[PDB]
Swiss-Prot record, chain C:
Quaternary context: Component of the 19S proteasome regulatory particle complex. The 26S proteasome consists of a 20S core particle (CP) and two 19S regulatory subunits (RP). The regulatory particle is made of a lid composed of 9 subunits, a base containing 6 ATPases including PSMC2 and few additional components. Interacts with NDC80/HEC; this interaction is detected only during M phase. Interacts and SQSTM1. Interacts with PAAF1. Directly interacts with TRIM5.
Induction info: Expression is not cell cycle-dependent and occurs throughout the cell cycle.
Upper taxonomic lineage: Eukaryota, Metazoa, Chordata, Craniata, Vertebrata
Range within the parent protein: 326 to 379 of 433
Compartments in which it is found: Cytoplasm
Organism of derivation: Homo sapiens
Coiled coil ranges: none
Superkingdom field: Eukaryota
Role summary: Component of the 26S proteasome, a multiprotein complex involved in the ATP-dependent degradation of ubiquitinated proteins. This complex plays a key role in the maintenance of protein homeostasis by removing misfolded or damaged proteins, which could impair cellular functions, and by removing proteins whose functions are no longer required. Therefore, the proteasome participates in numerous cellular processes, including cell cycle progression, apoptosis, or DNA damage repair.
PTM text: Monoubiquitinated by RNF181. Phosphorylated. Dephosphorylated by UBLCP1 which impairs PSMC2 ATPase activity and disrupts 26S proteasome assembly.
From Swiss-Prot, chain F:
Name listed for the protein in its UniProt record: Proteasome subunit alpha type-7
Modified residues annotated as Phosphotyrosine in this record: Y152
Gene Ontology biological-process annotations: proteasome-mediated ubiquitin-dependent protein catabolic process
Subunit relationships: The 26S proteasome consists of a 20S proteasome core and two 19S regulatory subunits. The 20S proteasome core is a barrel-shaped complex made of 28 subunits that are arranged in four stacked rings. The two outer rings are each formed by seven alpha subunits, and the two inner rings are formed by seven beta subunits. The proteolytic activity is exerted by three beta-subunits PSMB5, PSMB6 and PSMB7. PSMA7 interacts directly with the PSMG1-PSMG2 heterodimer which promotes 20S proteasome assembly. Interacts with HIF1A. Interacts with RAB7A. Interacts with PRKN. Interacts with ABL1 and ABL2. (Microbial infection) Interacts with HIV-1 TAT protein.
Signal peptide feature range: none
Induction: Down-regulated by the ribozyme Rz3'X. Up-regulated in colorectal cancer tissues.
Maturation and modification: Phosphorylation by ABL1 or ABL2 leads to an inhibition of proteasomal activity and cell cycle transition blocks.
Residues modified to N6-acetyllysine: K226
Protein origin, superkingdom: Eukaryota
Native species: Homo sapiens
Curated annotation (Swiss-Prot), chain H:
Cell compartment(s), UniProt: Cytoplasm; Nucleus
Keyword check for Acetylation: yes
Subunit structure: The 26S proteasome consists of a 20S proteasome core and two 19S regulatory subunits. The 20S proteasome core is a barrel-shaped complex made of 28 subunits that are arranged in four stacked rings. The two outer rings are each formed by seven alpha subunits, and the two inner rings are formed by seven beta subunits. The proteolytic activity is exerted by three beta-subunits PSMB5, PSMB6 and PSMB7. (Microbial infection) Interaction with HTLV-1 TAX protein favors NFKB1 activation.
Induction (UniProt): Down-regulated by antioxidants BO-653 and probucol.
Name of the molecule in the record: Proteasome subunit alpha type-4
Domain of life of the organism encoding this protein: Eukaryota
PTM-bearing positions, type N6-acetyllysine: K126, K175
Chief location: cytoplasm
GO cellular component term of the entry, any: extracellular exosome
Source organism of the structure: Homo sapiens (Human)
One example of a Gene Ontology biological process annotation: proteasome-mediated ubiquitin-dependent protein catabolic process
The keyword Ligase belongs to this UniProt entry's keyword annotation: no
UniProt KW keywords: Acetylation, Cytoplasm, Host-virus interaction, Nucleus, Phosphoprotein, Proteasome
Swiss-Prot record, chain I:
Cross-link entry Glycyl lysine isopeptide (Lys-Gly) (interchain with G-Cter in ubiquitin), positions: K112, K205
Its job: Component of the 20S core proteasome complex involved in the proteolytic degradation of most intracellular proteins. This complex plays numerous essential roles within the cell by associating with different regulatory particles. Associated with two 19S regulatory particles, forms the 26S proteasome and thus participates in the ATP-dependent degradation of ubiquitinated proteins.
Annotated Gene Ontology cellular component terms: centrosome; cytoplasm; cytosol; extracellular exosome; nucleoplasm; nucleus; proteasome complex; proteasome core complex
CDD domains listed in its UniProt record: proteasome_alpha_type_1 (cd03749)
Family annotation (InterPro entries): Ntn_hydrolases_N, Proteasome_alpha, Proteasome_alpha-type, Proteasome_alpha1, Proteasome_asu_N, Proteasome_sua/b
UniProt keyword terms in alphabetical order: Acetylation, Cytoplasm, Glycoprotein, Immunity, Isopeptide bond, Nucleus, Phosphoprotein, Proteasome, Ubl conjugation
Induction of expression: Induced in breast cancer tissue (at protein level). Up-regulated in liver tumor tissues.
Gene encoding the protein: PSMA1
Glycosylation site positions: S107
PROSITE patterns per UniProt: PROTEASOME_ALPHA_1, PROTEASOME_ALPHA_2
Protein name, per record: Proteasome subunit alpha type-1
Lineage: Eukaryota, Metazoa, Chordata, Craniata, Vertebrata
Length: 240, 228, 54, 240, 146, 239, 232, 250, 238
């Protein structure tokens, strides 16, 4: 039910709920776009398609793969204007970790800084809570790769493989049966399962021009965006 | 029933400044006439009870030395405009060694007539009649809570707003005298007031070019009544 | 209670409404409603209409 | 209704109607197009003359932010001059702090974060404007950008703002882009403004062309309009 | 109000016929009419309008000044013993009407008959004041106003 | 940091909060006060004591200085702020100008405080109405009053509280100079005027006088018995 | 902002605060917990599940230390918990920079709740939706306190919050005697933890932290899996 | 923006308060306190509102807050809004001693709090306090004093006041049975045990449900006594014996 | 009607109604006409008296030695922008020791009136201006609006029934170049008299004329020197 102004500002309902945050959970889905995060044993793959409807539109100013630091990359879902404001916060507070502390920020500590900022926007009743998601990858010293996800509610947790965007209940249900059967995960087994999970949920069987791969390696800790030629190499390899 | 306090009407006017002009009609009437011999000025006190001592109620307030006033509306809101108008004539004299003219007094009062808001309140609820003698002869000005400064020859404001102005234009011309303008004003007052005309209901204040200090008390007001 | 079918031409054509007096129609009422009773011949009725806005 | 008053509240499905209302305010405005050749950017703005109503050259919507940066504003003209002052003020601080000319990739991002910031609070409204950013450099080439009232800013080759948005860009993509000099583009822009917007609602109209590129040495200026007058003569040849 | 049933039609005509018969304006012979209700806000507006009734007499609430006679009048037709005090009962209670004092006087009469007496003692008036008058004492802003 | 107007105009040309604040003055205990030529008098009605509890802290007639005396109406919380504010002003006036503060200067401090307290934003106006009594230099007994709107006047006999119109109508039919001639007649006159306000058994009447040479002296409850007795004695001589 | 600062939590005409009663409804729909004081240590036991098998249980922690000997758990919501933990971390340091001595457990709860009460009266915000269980062994005798979104504080012996707390309240009223040991307390905290948990209680379904007199000690999942054998 | 404001400032159109009246009618629910004096000594009776078996009671001063070396208070209302006022009023009493090196009298401490509670009702739109508390103590001018605080910011001098709505029947007892200058430390305590036996609905007056704190003036110390465990019980066994003796006339 | 209250709130039609309600405040004022030539910029205004004894409210007001404005809206918003207008002219006189160009002065005005049309709690400045200046490139006639859209025009008119004045100016805009002063002014006051009823006209008591030019400081004429300008006219035919 609606009591007071519970449907408008961030206050409580009589049922112990609130609505503006769970309205923001389906503020992501109007983008019409899906991102998949898969962690391996020595790598972390980020695969996400893009839609280019116009011929008079660049193929380089669209990609949601953003470089936070030299060792931390991210992908953005939700709406576009709110996602880029979230990235400049992430670029900035990763730089203050270097100036204040001296060593490079962990990928786990950066999601605490982001989720506490999204807490306050929920918390003050006179501003908008920035509906967009946030998925990070990175290599940690003596911990291996990591995958984290932030939310507009303002909470994070660790992951092994979890997609976001529009199709979660279809993509994660595919990834549950993929992981719990205890397969191997080296490099290309991770990349091939990251393509086919998007290729069975969306059921497209595309051409190597819409998806982008943002893999990071233990041997190569730099965040790396793949070339269109080598994306085609991984795609025809899984085509038997 | 609670709209914005600063909102234009769909027809184009204002909301609360329009209500401010309505709140002058309940006030007491006041008449001032500009004449080349000098400016006379009249008001009605409207005594409510005989226990109330009358001389603590005033409507004519001097400003610096040669400028009078006449309030009609809310009393304590007018006391803010008076106390500012006294100071702004003193800053003019202790920075220029000359008397501020009657027009430029009213400009300094009419600046904050509509300077209300949330940052940087409500509009005031009193209309005034500034009259004085400066270098351009005697002057008489009229303002309102909308800040619409204007000059009048013989303005009458208060409760008898329409009734006095119609009777006043009936008997007025350019070559008046001072004694003729004094007796003509109280003829208008006794037609529009509800009580009788004595030395306790009304009061006068006439400023002259020679007699600069406007000065009028009891036992002379009875002389003007009994001669008419 | 205004029928458009009565406002078809043939039934009701001309609009005549009645309004309030400005000043003098009120004082016209005061002078008539006081001659019937014994009043003072030294009073006025314009002051009473000023006290009656509506 | 009930959810479309503040720009801070969400709809019960998860969007903001205050941004949605401001976008179609920009839609009720005259057509302004932009297109880049291989070595420059050509602007074209249709300008309306009611009967006389002003001079010949008043209130021109071809602003001039920097020495090498242009504007093609369209929509509510009063807020367009506000963004033109913010973009002017932004390019001077890049000059003072860093000592060289502002890249257009920053100048689109710095302005769009200011447009985005007026879509979060109940105190302010979103800007009712949309505009184009055209530049040219010897180390970066020509770029052409495009900013909506929400704040989504990315690259284009040809874009269009106004009432005739989808109707004008249909024949922009019929042209070629790489194999055209910008002297050829000037007479190609002039027919697109002349083809669309028939003289039915508005009989008389103007045509202002602005142009920056390799022929203009990187500096932005208006084309010689009264000189050589090749725009409207070649445009009115499409009479059948 | 007019409805369609046969329940309200016996009211509206009789209301209209009384308004008709009061003001038939033929010959009445100076008939005076006093009408009394408690409330006025849910009444007939066209009888409040002039031309029919031009007297609207209101009865505001009394004080403790009017009570002392009502205490004397109600404690007059009884066997008031000469060992009772009424002035303390007036001073203590600050809200009571003529019905309450009469309810005290009957309770004072009942307590005398219980223990088989004729006259009424002072404790009966005290116990009647503390039993009967405890039914409506609720709601007052004490200790805030001056 | 609060920006919200509370007192705005009405469509007919009135206010809202000022007429509402005068209602709280109407729901208060009555307190009258007259003057004379050498001695002033003021008394309060509706004491309403519990008769088992303390009473030195329920005293609502105070003095701002050694010359000026107070008597308010309305709610008691808003009076305590105005009184302790006005004690500071009449003490800081003595710091600059060496005189005792006149009764005219302290009422313009209270009334102009109470007006700008309604002019501003986000501020609940006061709900009190004071009776300011004090005889200045040259022996000038006079009394003023205030109002929640911020106006001030000079009266010769004031009445406030619950049923001031009945008391003011009683004093209206009592325009004598003989009652302001004798001192104890004027004190009994206040007791006569306050008698037809409350039940007035000589125990709910707290009066205090000032003979323009001394601070306020509360009369005794034994004094109030002899004053109520001589009032009832001369009233029965109408036969 | 603008400078509004107007309180959105007012008194009902019945005379209650409505929004604080609604914040307690969000606490009751949280994860269950149980805290038992047993005369030599205090045992905090929460009930930590994952929605899928895709999460990582070594990332988000429930039983959280404060200084060295003060543990703290919750039963309300998730993101509001991390604010007043970081607030209580910093607040325990100004005690140590002034007094050079570790803060008593009674002293934090006076200060955390005074943050939390003043937080509700202020304008433009909502109250928290988190109740706490703060414990620690200071000056020999251990302590176990509970806060709430109203900002009140209590002193329990064996309480339970979260879902089905009334079932755990009657169970601990019968099971817990006046005094036990720490090992008897861990056995009965698990014996009330799965009153409404799922069937499987692995090392990742629960997470238990204790406060010895040696200090706060969070149990690793090895000892939790080694103690969960023959539990209840 | 402006349609979310609650308007805790505007008068009622009746012409009285609208927000403070809700709290002053709320304050009688779930609280019972009283205090009596007529001679040397003054007490404070409290009431444990919920005494559950799984509780510590390790604080030994639950509702009594010793705010000074000479004064204490009994609070009733919002639990947490009490902690704001007791932290403030304890600090007002200490900045007085810093300024004068003289203990704060009981009168001008209560007035210092009631100016704070009033100012959060007039301006700001803040939620007002829902706290009514009592005062005891000793000064050098009058001695043993009692005061009653209100959420409106109004106080007063008392001798047998109370707080709770259940204790409105106790005032009817205290008007019926009170002595003027005959108080002991036995006649005052046995009266309070007689009040809470009737006003509380707890049968037989369990000693873990009441709480009594007294203030006496020993030599120069003003000893604030908080009595704990067995003196309460033998006071009940004294009171139950006097009830069993007086009922023999029946 | 719930979105027709504040300035921050947009519309489902896409049009802010508080600006649309501010345009109607300009039409309540009296009419005034500004035009120019090659060498001069003349604006002529029409005054209104409140009563028969009160003086006429002034319309034209001096700002600088080469800039003068007219007025068509409120009076508080008149002097509030007037005090901003005088302040900017003497700052550049103090800093650069040169008179301001007229075009970049008005760009400061449109930036000034933009802030109270976007933030909450402020009204738009409901006022209309006719800025007439002269600088190093010729005379200028500028009009503004509460929507903060300034127009470089050659001849406009704003106020009550100003549509009838515009139709006179469109069919005479060609003659407004080769005209010196006397036929420059008397073309302007024929536009005012077509904004009048057919029973009263200009009577040297409700009309003022301000001229600024190449060799002429901005001079305001009223009630004495208007009479040499009001001669050689003809009555309105009917």
């Amino acid at each position: 039910s609606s009591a007071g102004f519970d449907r408008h500002i961030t206050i409580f309902s009589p049922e112990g709920r609130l609505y503006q945050v769970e309205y923001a959970f389906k503020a992501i889905n109007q983008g019409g776009l899906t991102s998949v995060a898969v962690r391996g044993k020595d790598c972390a793959v980020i695969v996400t398609q893009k839609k280019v409807p116009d011929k008079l539109l660049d193929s380089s100013t669209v990609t949601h793969l953003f470089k936070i630091t030299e060792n931390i990359g991210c992908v953005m879902t939700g709406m576009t204007a709110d996602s880029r404001s979230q990235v400049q916060r992430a670029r900035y507070e990763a730089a203050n970790w270097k100036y204040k502390y001296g060593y490079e920020i962990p990928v786990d500590m950066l999601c605490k800084r982001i989720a506490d900022i999204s807490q306050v926007y929920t918390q003050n009743a006179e501003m908008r809570p920035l509906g967009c998601c946030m998925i990070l990858i990175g290599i940690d010293e003596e911990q291996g790769p990591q995958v984290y996800k932030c939310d507009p509610a303002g909470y994070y947790c660790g992951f092994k493989a979890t997609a976001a965007g529009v199709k979660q209940t279809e993509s994660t249900s595919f990834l549950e049966k993929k992981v719990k059967k205890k397969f191997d995960w080296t490099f290309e087994q991770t990349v091939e399962t990251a393509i086919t999970c998007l290729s069975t949920v969306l059921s497209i069987d595309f051409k190597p021009s819409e998806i982008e791969v943002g893999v990071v390696t233990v041997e190569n800790p730099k965040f790396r965006i793949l070339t269109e030629a080598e994306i085609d190499a991984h795609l025809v390899a899984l085509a038997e | 029933y609670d709209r914005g306090v600063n909102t234009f009407s769909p027809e184009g006017r204002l909301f609360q400044v329009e209500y401010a002009i309505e709140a002058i009609k309940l006030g007491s009437t006041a008449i001032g006439i500009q004449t080349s011999e000098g400016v006379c000025l009249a008001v009605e006190k409207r005594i409510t009870s005989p226990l109330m001592e009358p001389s603590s109620i005033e409507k004519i307030v001097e400003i610096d030395a040669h400028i009078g006033c006449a309030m009609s509306g809310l009393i304590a809101d007018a006391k803010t405009l008076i106390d500012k108008a006294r100071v702004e004539t003193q800053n003019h004299w202790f920075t220029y060694n000359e008397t501020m003219t009657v027009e430029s007094v009213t400009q300094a009062v009419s600046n904050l007539a509509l300077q209300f808001g949330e940052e940087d309140s409500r509009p005031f609820g009193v209309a005034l009649l500034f009259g004085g003698v400066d270098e351009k002869g005697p002057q008489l000005f009229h303002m309102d809570p909308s800040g619409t400064f204007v000059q009048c020859d013989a303005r009458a404001i208060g409760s008898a707003s329409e009734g006095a102005q119609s009777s006043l234009q009936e008997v007025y011309h350019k070559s008046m005298t001072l004694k003729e303008a004094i007796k003509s004003s109280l003829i208008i007052l006794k037609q529009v007031m509800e009580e009788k005309l004595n030395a306790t209901n009304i009061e006068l204040a006439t400023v002259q070019p020679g007699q600069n200090f406007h000065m009028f008390t009891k036992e002379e007001l009875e002389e003007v009544i009994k001669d008419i | 209670t205004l029928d458009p079918a009565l406002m078809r031409p043939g039934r009701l054509d001309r609009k005549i409404e009645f309004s309030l007096p400005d000043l003098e129609g009120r004082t016209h009422i005061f002078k008539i409603h006081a001659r019937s009773m014994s009043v003072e011949r030294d009073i006025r009725f314009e002051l009473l209409a000023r006290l009656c806005p509506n | 209704t009930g959810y479309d008053l503040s720009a801070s509240t969400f709809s019960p499905d998860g969007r903001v109607f205050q941004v949605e209302y401001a976008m179609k305010a920009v839609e009720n405005s005259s057509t302004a197009i932009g297109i880049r050749c291989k070595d420059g950017v050509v602007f074209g703005v249709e300008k309306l003359v009611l009967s006389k109503l002003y001079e010949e050259g008043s209130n021109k919507r071809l602003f001039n932010v920097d020495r090498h940066v242009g504007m093609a504003v369209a929509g509510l003209l009063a807020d367009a001059r506000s963004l033109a002052d913010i973009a002017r003020e932004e390019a001077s601080n890049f000059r003072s702090n860093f000592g060289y000319n502002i890249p257009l990739k920053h100048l689109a991002d710095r302005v769009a974060m200011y447009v985005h910031a007026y879509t979060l609070y109940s105190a302010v409204r979103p800007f009712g404007c949309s505009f184009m950013l055209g530049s040219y450099s010897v180390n970066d080439g020509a770029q052409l950008y495009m900013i909506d009232p929400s704040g989504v800013s990315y690259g284009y080759w040809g874009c269009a703002i106004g009432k005739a948005r989808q109707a004008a860009k249909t024949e922009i993509e019929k042209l070629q882009m790489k194999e055209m000099t910008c002297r050829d583009i000037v007479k190609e822009v002039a027919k697109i403004i002349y083809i669309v917007h028939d003289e039915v609602k508005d009989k008389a109209f103007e045509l202002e062309l602005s142009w920056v590129g390799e022929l203009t040495n990187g500096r932005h200026e208006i084309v010689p309009k009264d000189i050589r007058e090749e725009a409207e003569k070649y445009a009115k040849e499409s009479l059948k | 109000y007019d409805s369609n049933s046969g329940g309200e039609r016996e009211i509206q005509r009789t209301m209209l016929e009384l308004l008709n018969q009061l003001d038939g304006f033929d010959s009445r012979g100076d008939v005076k009419v006093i009408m009394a209700t408690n409330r006025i806000e849910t009444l007939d507006p066209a009888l409040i309008r002039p031309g029919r009734i031009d007297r609207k007499i209101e009865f505001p609430l009394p004080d403790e000044k009017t009570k002392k006679r009502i205490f004397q009048i109600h404690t007059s037709r009884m066997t008031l013993a000469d060992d009772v005090t009424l002035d303390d009962l007036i001073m203590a209670k600050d809200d009571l009407s003529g019905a309450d004092i009469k309810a005290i006087c009957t309770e004072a009469g009942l307590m005398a008959l219980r223990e088989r007496r004729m006259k009424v003692t002072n404790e009966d008036f005290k116990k009647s004041k503390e039993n009967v008058l405890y039914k409506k004492q609720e709601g007052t802003p004490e200790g805030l106003y001056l | 940091s609060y920006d919200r107007a509370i007192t705005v105009f009405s469509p007919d040309g009135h206010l809202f909060q000022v007429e509402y604040a005068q209602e709280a003055v109407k729901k208060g205990s009555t307190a009258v006060g007259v003057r004379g030529r050498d001695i002033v008098v003021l008394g309060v009605e509706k004491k309403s004591v519990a008769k088992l509890q303390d009473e030195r802290t329920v005293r609502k007639i105070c003095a701002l200085d050694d010359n000026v005396c107070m008597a308010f109406a309305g709610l008691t919380a808003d009076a305590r702020i105005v009184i302790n504010r006005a004690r500071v002003e009449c003490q800081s006036h003595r710091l600059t100008v060496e005189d005792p503060v006149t009764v005219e200067y302290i009422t313009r401090y209270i009334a102009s405080l109470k007006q700008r307290y309604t002019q501003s934003n986000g501020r609940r106006p006061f709900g009190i109405s004071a009776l300011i009594v004090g005889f200045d230099f040259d022996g000038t007994p006079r009394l003023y009053q205030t109002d929640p709107s911020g106006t001030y006047h000079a009266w010769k006999a004031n009445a406030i509280g619950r049923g001031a119109k009945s008391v003011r109508e009683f004093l209206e039919k009592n325009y004598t100079d003989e009652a302001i001639e004798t001192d104890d007649l004027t004190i009994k006159l206040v007791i006569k005027a306050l008698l037809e306000v409350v039940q007035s058994g000589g125990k709910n009447i707290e009066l205090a006088v000032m003979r323009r040479d001394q601070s306020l002296k509360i009369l005794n409850p034994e004094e109030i018995e002899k004053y109520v007795a001589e009032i009832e004695k001369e009233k029965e001589e109408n036969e | 902002e603008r400078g509004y600062s107007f309180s959105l939590t007012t008194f009902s005409p019945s005379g209650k605060l409505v929004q604080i009663e609604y914040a307690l409804a969000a606490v009751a729909g949280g994860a269950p917990s149980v805290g038992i004081k047993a005369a030599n240590g205090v045992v905090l036991a929460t009930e930590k599940k994952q929605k899928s098998i895709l999460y990582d249980e070594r990332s988000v922690h429930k039983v959280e230390p404060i200084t060295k000997h003060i543990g703290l758990v919750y039963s309300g919501m998730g993101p509001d918990y991390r604010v007043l933990v970081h607030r209580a971390r910093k607040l325990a340091q100004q005690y140590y920079l002034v007094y050079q001595e570790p803060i008593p457990t009674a002293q934090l709860v006076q200060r955390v709740a005074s943050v939390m009460q003043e937080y509700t009266q202020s304008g433009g915000v909502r109250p928290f939706g988190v109740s706490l269980l703060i414990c620690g062994w200071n000056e020999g005798r251990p302590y176990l306190f509970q806060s709430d979104p109203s900002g009140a504080y209590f002193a329990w012996k064996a309480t339970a919050m979260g879902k089905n707390y009334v079932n755990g309240k009657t169970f601990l009223e019968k099971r817990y005697n006046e005094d036990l040991e720490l090992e008897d307390a861990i056995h009965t905290a698990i014996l009330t933890l799965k009153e409404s948990f799922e069937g499987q209680m692995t090392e990742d379904n629960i997470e238990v932290g204790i406060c010895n007199e040696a200090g706060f000690r969070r149990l690793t999942p090895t000892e939790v899996k080694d103690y969960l054998a023959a539990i209840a | 923006s402006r349609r979310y404001d609650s308007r805790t400032t505007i008068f009622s159109p009746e012409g009285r308060l609208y927000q403070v009246e809700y709290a002053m009618e709320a304050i009688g629910h779930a609280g019972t306190c009283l205090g009596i004096l007529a001679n040397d000594g003054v007490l404070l009776a409290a009431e444990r509102r919920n005494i559950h078996k799984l509780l510590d009671e390790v604080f030994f001063s639950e509702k009594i807050y010793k705010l000074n070396e000479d004064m204490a208070c009994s609070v009733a209302g919002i639990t947490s809004d009490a902690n704001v006022l007791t932290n403030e009023l304890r600090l007002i009493a200490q900045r007085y001693l810093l300024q004068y090196q003289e203990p704060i009298p009981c009168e001008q401490l209560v007035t210092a709090l009631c100016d704070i509670k009033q100012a959060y009702t007039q301006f700001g739109g803040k939620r007002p306090f829902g706290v009514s508390l009592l005062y005891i103590g000793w000064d050098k001018h009058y001695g043993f004093q009692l005061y009653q605080s209100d959420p409106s910011g109004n106080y007063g001098g008392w001798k047998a006041t109370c707080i709770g709505n259940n204790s409105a029947a106790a005032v009817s007892m205290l008007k019926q049975d009170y002595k003027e200058g005959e108080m002991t430390l036995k006649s005052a305590l046995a009266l309070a045990i007689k009040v809470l036996n009737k006003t509380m609905d707890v049968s037989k007056l369990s000693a873990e449900k009441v709480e009594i704190a007294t203030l006496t003036r020993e030599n120069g110390k003003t000893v604030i006594r908080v009595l704990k465990q067995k003196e309460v019980e033998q006071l009940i066994k004294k009171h139950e014996e006097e009830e069993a003796k007086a009922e023999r006339e029946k | 009607n719930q979105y027709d209250n504040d300035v921050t709130v947009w519309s489902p039609q896409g049009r802010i109604h508080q600006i649309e309600y501010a345009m109607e405040a300009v039409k309540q004022g009296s009419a005034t006409v500004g035009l120019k030539s090659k060498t001069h910029a003349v604006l002529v205004a029409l005054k209104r008296a409140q009563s028969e004894l009160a003086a006429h409210q002034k319309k034209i007001l001096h700002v600088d030695n080469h800039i003068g404005i007219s007025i068509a809206g409120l009076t508080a918003d008149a002097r509030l922008l007037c005090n901003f207008m005088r302040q900017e002219c003497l700052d550049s006189r103090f800093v650069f020791d040169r008179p301001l160009p007229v075009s970049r002065l008005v760009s400061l005005i449109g930036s000034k009136t933009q802030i109270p049309t976007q933030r909450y709690g402020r009204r738009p400045y409901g006022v209309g201006l006719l800025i007439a200046g002269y600088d190093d490139m010729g005379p200028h006639i500028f009009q503004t609006c509460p929507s903060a859209n300034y127009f470089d025009c050659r001849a406009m008119s704003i106020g009550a029934r100003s549509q009838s004045a515009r139709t006179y100016l469109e069919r005479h805009m060609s003659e407004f170049m080769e005209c010196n002063l006397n036929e420059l002014v008397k073309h302007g006051l024929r536009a005012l008299r077509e904004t009048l009823p057919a029973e009263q006209d200009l009577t040297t008591k409700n009309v003022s004329i301000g001229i600024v030019g190449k060799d002429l400081e901005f001079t305001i004429y009223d009630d004495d020197d208007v009479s040499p300008f009001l001669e050689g006219l003809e009555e309105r035919p009917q």
